[PDB]
């Protein structure tokens, strides 16, 4: 009776059988529908497409994400996503495979309720639980005292955990990360005159971001370097073979994690948000938090990000105190890997919510550990 | 058949086998229970913690003392304390180990009764006695004519003894000492803006008190010195590496033993309480009492305390009379050391109360030497 583990990311869907070392489905969180007129009656095969098929088709298609910032805004397309996840990708009959699902903290409670209602009523899943991504990230990182920094496609959030106790007041969240960084990269690349506009071109700019971007250790020094020298410049080849050339823009994009002023946000950067979250924690906790600063993947894949963060936190925090940042190469998968661990634990299984309980406690039982 | 000797301090628990030179358990009189929510199911291992483990955990935990001012106010946690003392610390099976227990004088008789009832019925201890801490302090100090000054975490009390006869009317007691001095130190440090609030921060301020505080020989001269010069100032480093700097506050804290007006108490200081206790004694006794003024440790560890006391008593008492203050470096352990001596004495053993006698005299036999 292998449990299923499904992580519904704002940008990538990750679905895997519990106890497996990696997800099997990793396809994009994307549904597309043709803007253009169909004429070849044999060829207008589908009115809608799921993210892998939709990506190849995207040149004709309009693409929409069903999730914005860990919130689900098109339940019909989200049902399409899950239907394709279970039948097409995992080839699994969910009647027999109880499921673990993930969410950002401080999400609307209606989202969790509606997701659970869909899971039981539409898919007839026999048991379910919803788990908080920071806790999964700590299970993936093999430790029980940590502060977790997360940045998927949508939310960025900071959660402190100590001896397995969570500090709900110390949580801090920014709606920023991948999508806003991509849009800002579109604008900056517009500064050079590469007009990208379509959602397909948005996906191209996302790939440009994911390859080319690196994080400055000294933003002003890098700006002076790019002004004084071309050595930072890179070239990239668009799908039509056109060449695009990029310089300072590369580091200027992820730098807008630290300086959301470039988006026009006033909220302090991820470094100051981490430091402030640590300050919210009771004084003794802080020392162990500085020793155990864990990164939850996604955008934190960038080159240099951990070194820049360490430099900033060491500047912010008192001296004579070890500040250490843990970011494995699996950090992106690490949320799913944590779910894969948690579902396997013999101690965990009584945490399951059973269809009987959902048919008796109403929804509200899903809130039990809402955090 | 080595007897057990257990001293239950208001702030530290001290338990040791009779005839040993030092206690083995010295752990804090503390139980803690998590205020924060547990989420890592593998990690919320215990609902409660004992003082050594509870101190490390304290950053998450709320801490409570089960004793206030030599009175036991949470018997459940006190049973936890004794259970951990016997099984976890001393690794000893109390079925075979008759026990000596300590109390402040003028305690409620119910406290001694309930403690004895627990000891026999819950732990099945075969024999017990309760002994008065001043007498133990004199055994530790090798003499049988003394006046004893005590100040643990809770009670301060003065007891005169002459040739081994005790003067019950001359006893004087103040509920003051360590805890009130710590709270006052919290307020004074608040005067500089170091906001300490949590019980964990209370423990930090306790450590600050125990290291930094020293007793003035001339309080007004010291106040003028601290006003005119920084030379009295000291720095200390909090657990999070933040630095705290402290000046006049250092001597101003223990000075509030001599001037309880700073707490708002009207009772005269330890010096005047000692002098008045000596005055209660019959006239001939006084000369030998001035020669034999013994300090029972705890707060009397402060630097300068004995010199200040000698200055005060020599000012209060008539001239041309030797006033001498005995305060060994073991003075804190000296209560336990006295118990370790007393339990060993061949003459003493008939003082034991046996479970038969407790099953026949009811409790009341524990009152025989209630003092």
């Amino acid at each position: 009776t292998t449990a299923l583990v499904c992580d519904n990311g704002s940008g990538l869907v990750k679905a895997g059988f519990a106890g497996d070392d990696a997800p099997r489905a990793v396809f994009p969180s994307i549904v597309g529908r043709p803007r253009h007129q169909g004429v070849m009656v044999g060829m207008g095969q589908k009115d809608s497409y799921v993210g892998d098929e939709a990506q190849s088709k995207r040149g004709i298609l309009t693409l929409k994400y069903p999730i914005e910032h860990g919130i689900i805004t098109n339940w019909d397309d989200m049902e399409k996503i899950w239907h394709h996840t279970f039948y097409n990708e995992l080839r699994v009959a969910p009647e027999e495979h109880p499921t673990l699902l993930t969410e950002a903290p401080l999400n609307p409670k209606a989202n969790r309720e509606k997701m659970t209602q869909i899971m039981f009523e539409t898919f007839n899943v026999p048991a379910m639980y919803v788990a908080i991504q920071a806790v999964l990230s700590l299970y993936a990182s093999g430790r029980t005292t940590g502060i977790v920094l997360d940045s998927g496609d949508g939310v960025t959030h900071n959660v402190p955990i100590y001896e397995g106790y969570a500090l709900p007041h110390a949580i801090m969240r920014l709606d920023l990360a991948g999508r806003d960084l991509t849009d800002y990269l579109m604008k900056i690349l517009t500064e050079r005159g590469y007009s990208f506009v379509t959602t397909a071109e948005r996906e191209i700019v996302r790939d440009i971001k994911e390859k080319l971007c690196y994080v400055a250790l000294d933003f002003e020094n890098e700006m002076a370097t790019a002004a004084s020298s071309s050595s930072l410049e890179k070239s990239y080849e668009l799908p039509d073979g056109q060449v695009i050339t990029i310089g300072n823009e590369r580091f200027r994009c992820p730098e807008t994690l630290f300086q959301p002023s470039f988006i026009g946000m006033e909220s302090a950067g991820i470094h100051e948000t981490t430091y402030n979250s640590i300050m919210k924690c009771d004084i003794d906790i802080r020392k162990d938090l500085y020793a155990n600063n864990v990164m939850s993947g996604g955008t934190t894949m960038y080159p240099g990000i951990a070194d820049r963060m360490q430099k900033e936190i060491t500047a912010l925090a008192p001296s004579t105190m070890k500040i250490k940042i843990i970011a494995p190469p699996e950090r992106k998968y690490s949320v799913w890997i944590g779910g894969s661990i948690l579902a396997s634990l013999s101690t965990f299984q009584q945490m399951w919510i059973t269809k009987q309980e959902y048919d008796e406690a109403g929804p509200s039982i899903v809130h039990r550990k809402c955090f | 058949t080595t007897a057990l000797v257990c001293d239950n301090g208001s702030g530290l628990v001290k338990a040791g086998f009779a005839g040993d030179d030092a206690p083995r358990a010295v752990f804090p009189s503390i139980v803690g229970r998590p205020r924060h929510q547990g989420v890592m199911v593998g990690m919320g291992q215990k609902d409660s913690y004992v003082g050594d483990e509870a101190q490390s955990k304290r950053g998450i935990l709320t801490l409570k003392y089960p004793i206030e001012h030599g009175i036991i106010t949470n018997w459940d946690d006190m049973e936890k304390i004794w259970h951990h003392t016997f099984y976890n610390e001393l690794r000893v099976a109390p079925e075979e180990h008759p026990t000596l227990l300590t109390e402040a004088p003028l305690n409620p008789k119910a406290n001694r009764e309930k403690m004895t009832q627990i000891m026999f019925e819950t732990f099945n201890v075969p024999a017990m006695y309760v002994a008065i801490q001043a007498v133990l302090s004199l055994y530790a100090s090798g003499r049988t004519t003394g006046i004893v000054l005590d100040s643990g975490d809770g009670v301060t009390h003065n007891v005169p003894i002459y040739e081994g006869y005790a003067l019950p009317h001359a006893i004087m007691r103040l509920d003051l000492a360590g805890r009130d001095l710590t709270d006052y130190l919290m307020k004074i440090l608040t005067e500089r803006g170091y906001s300490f609030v949590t019980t964990a921060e209370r423990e930090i301020v306790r450590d600050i008190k125990e290291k930094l505080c020293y007793v003035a020989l001339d309080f007004e001269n010291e106040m003028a010195t601290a006003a005119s010069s920084s030379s009295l100032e000291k720095s200390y480093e909090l657990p999070d590496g933040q630095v705290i700097t402290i000046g006049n506050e250092r001597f101003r804290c223990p000075e509030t033993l001599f001037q309880p007006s700073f707490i708002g108490m009207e009772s005269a200081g330890i010096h005047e309480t000692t002098y008045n206790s000596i005055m209660k004694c019959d006239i001939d006794i006084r000369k030998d009492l001035y020669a034999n003024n013994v300090m029972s440790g705890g707060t009397t560890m402060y630097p300068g305390i004995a010199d200040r006391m000698q200055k005060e008593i020599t000012a209060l008492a008539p001239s041309t009379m030797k006033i001498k203050i005995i305060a060994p470096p073991e003075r804190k352990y000296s209560v336990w050391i006295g118990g370790s001596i007393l339990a060993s004495l061949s003459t003493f053993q008939q003082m034991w109360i046996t479970k038969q006698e407790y099953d026949e005299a009811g409790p009341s036999i524990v009152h025989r030497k209630c003092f």
Partner: peptide, 13 residues
Amino acid sequence: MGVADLIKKFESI
């Protein structure tokens, strides 16, 4: 680092 090892670690704890 492998998932099985982490499972055995937390089940041991």
